[PDB]
């Protein structure tokens, strides 16, 4: 029976591949062939945020596009005012091993997590005037790799237990559990409508998940190594995955197969973080070679390089108005770019 | 000045936050970072209790005016290559190996625990992150190993072992096999200590090894080595 199930599964995979090939007549490279190239992209460093003493692992901007939050291995979660480089807040984390952080859309809460398998939500707007641990979420059996806020009460986290979770903060219990990944889930991205989300794992595949139903809508298998980053397109109909094979890949949900690959010969290091611009025309990807490339998403050509960090660029973010791009590296310095 | 009164007060708050961050960094910088690693039932728990007496679990203790933090990853069922870079820069790595499992084949398989331990030691020691980080090798369960080798030849684990079935010779042979896995002979040093569950000098040996590592780091900082 097991052999029959396996052959049924491989026949279904063959049917999947044939259906994907049938709905593939013009390559994205051919459609975006007569368009005007972006050209050289020159972005200069405008602000340098100093105060972190260990390597920075995470960063999130927020809706106001002015404040931001950074997480570093020294055990401090620092909320900066990027305009004036002022430190608005500095929360001492209970666990120094933090590798993810999120800033709530309302701004009243901030999330963090890491090797302790616990997602900590801190209340920023308190009557006492300080920052307190609003909630601690436990239940993941692996390290917390990413977390994103749906609203003030719902959060979505990814962990190294090949499982994603949707938590109700007030109760503190896992409202929904998304399972089906074979490898460690390393990053997740939330759709603009907050109804679907894509998670990339170490099984060299990405999965589009339905938040409400809890079912896996789609599965995309184009990469050849661990997927370390993922990010929706601004329209929410596509996404981009950076992986360890030194390539980025743009997939589309409606097409259901891979659209584009972003790679160059002199790049052999993996991608730690990816992000899109406001219009989605530019795809920014931080690499292990201490740099941060800027690709033309439509043309797949290299547009720019953000070479200002002395160590691996670990986290990348773009403001919701696209005003600036923040890069946090392992040299304990954040840099804003315009 | 262009700044407003509220802007000036915000800048003053930022300066106070900066000074608190600097104080915290100075407090943390004088504190030893030890990464505890080992195979299943290697003896990490016994080492933890020994240190205490004299996701991730952190053990804090003090010896000779030195504060030691030990990070026992332990129950982290995930790829080590995805979070092992977080421990780059620790003062030392304490690797625990159980001698008695040289002739025990229940890996989880048909390969003994000692081969798996040597594979893990090769992975950690020759990892790109820990090229300069010294390894503190703890060969635990020396008494049970000595009792075992009375009737269980080491040939079960090492078929090229022509030495006698004696505690000292076999122990030296096993130590040499673990030390030969160090490709980074010049950049790092392996400190070997033979321990059990009924000894109290383990913390003293860890203190001495950390002192040697600190002296070497100071010599490298001054360019004198």
């Amino acid at each position, epitope marked *: 029976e097991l052999d029959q199930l396996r052959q049924e599964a491989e026949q279904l995979k063959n049917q999947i591949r044939d259906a994907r090939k049938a709905c593939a007549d013009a390559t994205l490279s051919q459609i975006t062939n007569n368009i005007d190239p972006v050209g050289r992209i020159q972005m200069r460093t405008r602000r340098t945020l100093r105060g972190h003493l260990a390597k920075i692992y995470a960063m999130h901007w927020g809706t106001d596009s*002015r*404040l931001l939050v950074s997480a570093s291995q020294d055990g401090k979660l620092i909320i900066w*005012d990027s305009y004036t480089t*002022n430190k*608005v*807040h500095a929360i001492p984390l209970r666990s120094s091993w933090v590798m993810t952080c999120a800033y709530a859309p309302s*701004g009243n809460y901030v999330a963090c997590g890491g090797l302790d398998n616990i997602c900590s939500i801190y209340n920023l*707007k308190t*009557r*006492e*005037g*300080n920052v307190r641990v609003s909630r601690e979420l436990a239940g993941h059996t692996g390290y917390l790799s990413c977390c994103r806020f749906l609203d003030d009460n719902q959060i979505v986290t990814s962990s190294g237990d090949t499982t994603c979770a949707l938590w109700d903060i007030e109760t503190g219990q896992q409202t929904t559990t998304f399972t089906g990944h074979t490898g460690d889930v390393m990053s997740l991205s939330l759709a603009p409508d907050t109804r679907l989300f894509v998670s990339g794992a170490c099984d060299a595949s990405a999965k589009l998940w339905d938040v409400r139903e809890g079912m896996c809508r789609q599965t995309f298998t184009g990469h050849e190594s661990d997927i370390n980053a993922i990010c929706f397109f601004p329209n929410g109909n596509a996404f981009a995955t950076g992986s360890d094979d030194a390539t980025c890949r743009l997939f589309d949900l409606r097409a259901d197969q891979e659209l584009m690959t972003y790679s160059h010969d002199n790049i052999i290091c993996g991608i730690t973080s990816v992000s899109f611009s406001k219009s989605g025309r530019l795809l920014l990807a931080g690499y292990d070679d201490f740099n941060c490339n800027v690709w033309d998403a439509l043309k797949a050509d290299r547009a720019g390089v953000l070479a200002g960090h002395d160590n691996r660029v670990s986290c990348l973010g773009v403001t919701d108005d696209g005003m600036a791009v923040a890069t946090g590296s392992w040299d304990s310095f954040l840099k804003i770019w315009n | 000045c*262009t700044l*407003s*009164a*509220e*802007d*000036k*007060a*915000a800048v*003053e*708050r930022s300066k*106070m936050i900066d000074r608190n961050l600097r104080e915290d960094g100075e407090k943390a910088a004088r504190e030893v970072k030890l990464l505890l690693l080992g195979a299943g039932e290697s003896g990490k728990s016994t080492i933890v209790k020994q240190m205490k007496i004299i996701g991730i679990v952190e053990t804090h203790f003090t010896f000779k005016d030195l504060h030691f933090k030990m990070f026992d990853v332990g129950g982290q069922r995930s790829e080590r290559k995805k979070w092992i870079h977080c421990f780059e820069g620790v003062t030392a790595i304490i690797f625990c190996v159980a001698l008695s499992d040289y002739d025990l084949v229940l890996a989880e398989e048909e390969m003994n625990r000692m081969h798996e331990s040597m594979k893990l030691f090769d992975s950690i020691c020759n990892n790109k992150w820990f090229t300069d980080t010294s390894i503190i090798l703890f060969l635990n369960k020396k008494d049970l190993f000595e009792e075992k080798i009375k009737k269980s030849p080491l040939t079960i684990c090492y078929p090229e072992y022509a030495g006698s079935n004696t505690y000292e010779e076999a122990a030296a042979y096993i130590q040499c096999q673990f030390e030969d896995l160090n490709k980074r002979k010049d950049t790092k040093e392996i400190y070997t200590h033979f321990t059990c569950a009924t000894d109290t000098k383990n913390v003293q040996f860890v203190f001495d090894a950390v002192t040697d590592v600190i002296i070497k780091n100071n010599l490298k900082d001054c360019g004198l080595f």
Partner: single-chain antibody, 236 residues
Framework: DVQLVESGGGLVQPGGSRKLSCSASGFAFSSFGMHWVRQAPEKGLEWVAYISSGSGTIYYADTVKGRFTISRDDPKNTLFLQMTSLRSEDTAMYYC??????????????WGQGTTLTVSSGGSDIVMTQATSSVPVTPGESVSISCRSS???????????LYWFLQRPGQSPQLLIYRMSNLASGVPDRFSGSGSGTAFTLTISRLEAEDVGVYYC?????????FGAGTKLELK
């Protein structure tokens, strides 16, 4: 919840000295700057002194400069005001006010109850004008409280440093609007702040019985903070 309790007030001979202490509980005292503000027996509010968090920055009013000294004991969470050579102009009720400054913060959140001191019997400062002394009002109606400034309170960073306070009869003032637009926490959405430049208005929609009181207009651009003369409301 958070509270500030003032003590040390009483009848003192003019030319003497007196120590006032404000005890703070329920909040991080060391992270809040502290202001001392008097109110005359039948007149409006008047800023007196200020000490920043960590005692780094200290300011005094021109009337009280030299004679008074403001200090804070963070470990025991107390705010001290020493007063020497007291004149007949210092008979007032004093309030200690907490105020934290960062991006998006609301200064002057909480006011102390105040302590009464009664002794036996300028220029280069922005003057805040509230010409309307008092108007009758009917519950459930809409009233607008106007404010005037001699110098524009809008800064180059886009913030208009105007604060609105309400003082109910027999109660300490509380913050309603901070920076001319934002509503303070716990304030009903009835109150709306507006204005631009040197003229400002405060709008109350469908007011009720506990909206009766004196409304004060205070500036925070140049640090010699000045309050308005006051615009009190009466029911019909």
């Amino acid at each position: 919840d958070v509270q500030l309790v003032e003590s040390g007030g009483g009848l003192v001979q003019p030319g003497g000295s007196r120590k006032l202490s404000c005890s703070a509980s329920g909040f991080a005292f060391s992270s809040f700057g502290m202001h001392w503000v008097r109110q005359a027996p039948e007149k409006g509010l008047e800023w007196v002194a200020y000490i920043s968090s960590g005692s780094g920055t200290i300011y005094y009013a021109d009337t009280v400069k030299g004679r008074f000294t403001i200090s804070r004991d963070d470990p025991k969470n107390t705010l001290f005001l020493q007063m020497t050579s007291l004149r007949s102009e210092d008979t007032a009720m004093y309030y200690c006010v907490r105020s934290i400054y960062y991006y998006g913060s609301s200064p002057f959140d909480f006011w102390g109850q105040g302590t009464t001191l009664t002794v036996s019997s300028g220029g280069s400062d922005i003057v805040m004008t509230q010409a309307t002394s008092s108007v009758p009002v009917t519950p459930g109606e809409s009233v607008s409280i106007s404010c005037r400034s001699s110098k524009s309170l809008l800064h180059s960073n886009g913030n208009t440093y105007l604060y609105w306070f309400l003082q109910r009869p027999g109660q300490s003032p509380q913050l309603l609007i901070y920076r001319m637009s934002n509503l303070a926490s716990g304030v009903p959405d009835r109150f709306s702040g507006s204005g631009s430049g040197t003229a400002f208005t405060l709008t109350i929609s469908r007011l009720e019985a506990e909206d009766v009181g004196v409304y004060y207009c205070m500036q925070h651009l140049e640090y010699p903070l000045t309050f308005g003369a006051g615009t009190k409301l009466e029911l019909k």
